[PDB]
Amino acid sequence: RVGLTGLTVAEYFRDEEGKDVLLFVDNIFRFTQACSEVSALLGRIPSAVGYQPTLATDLGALQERITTTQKGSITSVQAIYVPADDLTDPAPATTFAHLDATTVLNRGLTELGIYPAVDPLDST
Amino acid sequence: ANLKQLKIRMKAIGSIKKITKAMKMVAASKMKAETSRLENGRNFAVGSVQKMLENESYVQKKKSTTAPKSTLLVPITSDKGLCGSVNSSIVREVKRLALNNRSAFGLLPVGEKGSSGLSRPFPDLLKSSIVNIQNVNFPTAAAIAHQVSTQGAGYDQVTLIYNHFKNAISYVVKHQELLPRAQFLNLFKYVTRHEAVEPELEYSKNYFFELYMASSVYNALLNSSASEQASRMNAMENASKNAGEILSKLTLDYNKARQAKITMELIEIISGASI
Amino acid sequence: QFLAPYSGCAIGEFFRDNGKHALIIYDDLSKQAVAYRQMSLLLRRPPGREAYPGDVFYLHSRLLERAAKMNDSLGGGSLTALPVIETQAGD
Amino acid sequence: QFLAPYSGCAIGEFFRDNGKHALIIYDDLSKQAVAYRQMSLLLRRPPGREAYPGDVFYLHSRLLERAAKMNDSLGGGSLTALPVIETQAGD
């Protein structure tokens, strides 16, 4: 819920202040992971690869509360960690369904002396 | 789906792509030398004997113009395998021209793959071949020209089938037509426009025949050798490409099998914990 | 999420039974399977392959089986369906 | 299906203990495990890996271990077993 905490702080500025907010969130993998851990402890049967059955709902809440309204907007720049380098994993798969753009940081560019880490081709 | 087996087969494709990618580097390195050697040896005394013979007007007047009924084919192929599709093309063309009419060609092959591939289709026709050439050089090509001279007395014409290295990525099969010693000597003795007195005509006729034969042979080897490395490099590029595509496809299936494995084992643990 | 597809389908049958023509479009149904998978797992039901319930087939079939072309005697109405499915790796 | 293998095995022990030689051929045992698994699952017993009971190894071991070559003191009889196993995809 720490991720939702920052969201609540941002929603205050969105509605009351009416100004645009930029919500930075650590890699969503640990967010989805915590939801799976709490679910297992509570006694819920895990999902296919161990996630919680409420993955879509638990994740949909956060992904839906972040949008543009008539008062303001909350742009969220969150990192994405793919476990085991499996793009078909439920966590990144369900996340990509909501992501509108992707910022891929490349390590090679830094070595050449160019230090915007963003990759022009990989980014979409 | 037995992740252990999939991960092993993925490892095999990785090594194949690795060695396949490495041979491509060597294919380019050797192609560089062949191109450097070809550019330095190309057009060496080519058409010289043909030009002067054409300049010999009196010769053309008495030139015996007939169609050779029996010819000798000497295809040129590479000995090392996995060199590309150049060998398949040469053995394919000679096979067509030979299968059509039999007993009218000696078919003395050159190269392991050229001779091996034509051994089964044309038995009793090809009797000897040259293979395991350490290096390409005029002294060696001359020895090859001599062997063809010995076997060319029985046939009315001689021709060589080989790949023409026109571009680093374009190799077109090209075939030269050379007349035997007997026809060349009888044709050469009529030479009168170009004086030959320092060596007498009886000697110059035989010596210039070698130059006429070795020049074509030496030129063909370079073109074929350059096409070998060129075709090999392209083959490894296409092979390494296919190796990578298949390896990536199996990676997806490996991940899919990994998820199913966790699901299967996880359901078993929940089933036992339920009771 | 599990009920929304059936609710819309019933709206389409209205035009179907009254001789009218309707075209109902169903967004990606994998969301429904996840939603139904959620309820199923929470109900302590035994999950099958890929953690999907054994009756996941009947879930989608019973829905799409109601979209058809009624005869002319009943009104000649129809109900076209365009179900969508999302493939992870195009498999 | 669970007792048929042991049933036929008992018939072989007759020739074995009587100094005779008998050959018993057990057909696919995977089908026995399904029946033994089914019989165990329906008894509300805790299932093991792959839904099979925990003592499935003891099942076949107890059955095949009986086949032996008796000593001359008991008649010199022998029982030979040729169990069959069907694989799904050669795994």
Side-chain angles (χ1 to χ4, degrees):
Chain A
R1 308 303 181 185
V2 64
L4 306 180
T5 303
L7 180 60
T8 304
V9 178
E11 288 172 341
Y12 178 90
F13 303 144
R14 181 186 61 179
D15 302 330
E16 303 292 45
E17 302 296 349
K19 51 180 62 173
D20 304 356
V21 186
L22 186 58
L23 177 60
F24 293 95
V25 184
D26 197 355
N27 58 88
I28 196 70
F29 175 75
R30 286 207 288 271
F31 171 83
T32 302
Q33 181 178 359
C35 294
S36 180
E37 296 176 10
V38 299
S39 180
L41 297 175
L42 292 171
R44 304 194 183 98
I45 301 179
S47 180
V49 303
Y51 290 107
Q52 67 282 5
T54 59
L55 177 57
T57 303
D58 295 334
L59 183 62
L62 173 55
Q63 303 289 24
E64 290 290 1
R65 292 172 61 180
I66 302 174
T67 180
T68 299
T69 60
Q70 307 301 341
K71 303 179 180 181
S73 61
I74 295 168
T75 304
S76 178
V77 179
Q78 58 182 355
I80 301 297
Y81 175 86
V82 183
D85 304 330
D86 184 2
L87 299 176
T88 59
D89 183 75
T94 58
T95 304
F96 302 154
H98 297 270
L99 303 183
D100 301 330
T102 178
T103 301
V104 180
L105 305 192
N106 189 328
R107 191 68 168 276
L109 278 290
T110 60
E111 300 180 1
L112 278 58
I114 306 169
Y115 291 98
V118 304
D119 188 318
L121 299 177
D122 303 0
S123 300
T124 59
Chain B
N2 194 332
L3 283 65
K4 190 177 186 301
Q5 295 293 353
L6 297 175
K7 181 160 61 179
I8 290 168
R9 188 157 67 90
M10 290 173 59
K11 180 180 178 181
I13 300 177
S15 59
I16 291 173
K17 180 180 176 182
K18 187 189 302 307
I19 278 62
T20 302
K21 192 70 175 58
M23 292 186 292
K24 189 180 67 57
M25 295 294 187
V26 177
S29 180
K30 293 185 177 300
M31 182 179 64
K32 188 187 298 304
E34 297 293 348
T35 51
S36 180
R37 180 179 298 180
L38 173 59
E39 295 290 352
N40 295 21
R42 65 182 306 93
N43 66 47
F44 173 86
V46 311
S48 295
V49 176
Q50 296 77 337
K51 176 181 290 184
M52 63 86 66
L53 285 172
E54 292 171 2
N55 297 332
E56 291 292 342
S57 48
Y58 182 80
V59 170
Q60 279 55 281
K61 307 302 296 184
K62 279 56 174 61
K63 185 196 299 302
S64 180
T65 60
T66 60
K69 313 310 301 182
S70 58
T71 182
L72 177 57
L73 316 183
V74 281
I76 308 181
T77 66
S78 58
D79 60 83
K80 289 298 190 69
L82 306 178
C83 61
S85 62
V86 294
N87 295 337
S88 60
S89 181
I90 271 61
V91 302
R92 185 187 305 176
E93 181 176 353
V94 64
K95 180 182 293 183
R96 177 181 58 81
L97 186 66
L99 286 182
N100 191 328
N101 189 325
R102 198 70 66 86
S103 69
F105 310 91
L107 187 63
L108 183 152
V110 182
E112 296 289 2
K113 297 293 178 298
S115 68
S116 177
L118 301 177
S119 60
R120 298 156 57 91
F122 298 96
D124 201 331
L125 276 294
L126 59 88
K127 297 179 289 185
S128 60
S129 65
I130 297 79
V131 297
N132 298 335
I133 301 175
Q134 276 55 98
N135 52 20
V136 184
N137 57 327
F138 192 81
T140 302
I144 308 311
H146 189 85
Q147 274 289 347
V148 177
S149 182
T150 59
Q151 310 300 346
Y155 294 90
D156 301 70
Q157 185 178 24
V158 183
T159 181
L160 317 87
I161 290 72
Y162 64 100
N163 302 88
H164 190 77
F165 179 84
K166 56 174 288 300
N167 193 273
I169 57 175
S170 187
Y171 21 82
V172 298
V173 180
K174 174 172 172 295
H175 50 64
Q176 283 296 142
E177 300 180 358
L178 313 180
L179 72 169
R181 186 192 299 272
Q183 289 71 353
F184 184 79
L185 298 183
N186 299 333
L187 179 152
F188 192 82
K189 78 185 188 182
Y190 302 160
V191 167
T192 181
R193 194 191 192 91
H194 299 60
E195 183 185 17
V197 292
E198 295 299 341
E200 290 291 349
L201 182 58
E202 64 183 350
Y203 313 91
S204 182
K205 62 194 292 181
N206 299 99
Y207 299 162
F208 274 98
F209 168 69
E210 294 175 84
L211 181 68
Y212 168 81
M213 190 63 62
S215 62
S216 301
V217 171
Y218 178 85
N219 193 106
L221 299 181
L222 301 178
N223 297 21
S224 61
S225 60
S227 182
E228 178 180 359
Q229 303 297 348
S231 185
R232 187 187 302 277
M233 184 185 64
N234 298 21
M236 303 305 85
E237 178 61 13
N238 191 327
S240 179
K241 174 177 173 60
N242 301 326
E245 297 178 1
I246 301 172
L247 181 59
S248 60
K249 195 273 290 184
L250 301 182
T251 303
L252 300 176
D253 301 359
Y254 176 84
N255 298 333
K256 182 178 181 180
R258 185 183 62 85
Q259 299 178 359
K261 179 176 178 297
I262 300 173
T263 302
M264 184 179 64
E265 299 180 1
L266 185 58
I267 294 170
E268 298 169 2
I269 301 170
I270 296 296
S271 180
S274 300
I275 184 175
Chain C
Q1 300 181 8
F2 147 84
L3 185 62
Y6 298 88
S7 300
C9 180
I11 300 171
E13 297 175 3
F14 166 82
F15 307 97
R16 184 191 63 179
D17 300 0
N18 300 125
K20 298 176 182 178
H21 306 266
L23 167 59
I24 182 167
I25 306 178
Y26 311 93
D27 228 311
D28 300 76
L29 295 175
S30 60
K31 308 300 183 299
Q32 183 183 5
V34 174
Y36 186 79
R37 181 180 61 179
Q38 176 179 332
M39 303 188 300
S40 300
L41 296 176
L42 295 175
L43 288 170
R44 310 296 298 187
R45 297 180 178 180
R49 63 190 302 93
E50 297 184 5
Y52 289 100
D55 62 71
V56 64
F57 168 81
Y58 179 63
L59 179 67
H60 296 350
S61 70
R62 92 187 79 173
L63 177 60
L64 303 178
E65 289 291 352
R66 299 186 298 179
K69 170 63 180 183
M70 310 304 297
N71 60 78
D72 301 330
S73 181
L74 298 176
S78 66
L79 176 56
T80 304
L82 297 176
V84 182
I85 295 295
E86 180 179 355
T87 312
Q88 303 295 348
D91 60 330
Chain D
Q1 304 176 8
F2 159 81
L3 297 173
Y6 295 92
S7 299
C9 185
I11 301 172
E13 297 180 358
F14 168 81
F15 301 90
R16 184 187 64 179
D17 302 330
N18 299 19
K20 296 177 179 297
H21 303 262
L23 171 55
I24 182 162
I25 309 179
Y26 311 92
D27 276 332
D28 301 329
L29 301 177
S30 61
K31 296 179 174 58
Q32 181 188 2
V34 171
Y36 182 64
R37 181 184 63 179
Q38 175 184 335
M39 184 174 62
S40 61
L41 292 173
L42 296 174
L43 289 171
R44 307 301 303 180
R45 293 183 176 180
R49 55 179 293 182
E50 296 182 0
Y52 294 94
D55 62 330
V56 64
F57 172 85
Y58 174 59
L59 182 69
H60 298 351
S61 69
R62 169 178 54 184
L63 176 60
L64 303 174
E65 194 63 27
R66 305 178 187 179
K69 170 61 181 181
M70 307 306 299
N71 56 18
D72 301 70
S73 180
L74 276 57
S78 64
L79 176 57
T80 305
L82 294 177
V84 183
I85 289 290
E86 181 178 356
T87 310
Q88 302 295 350
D91 56 330

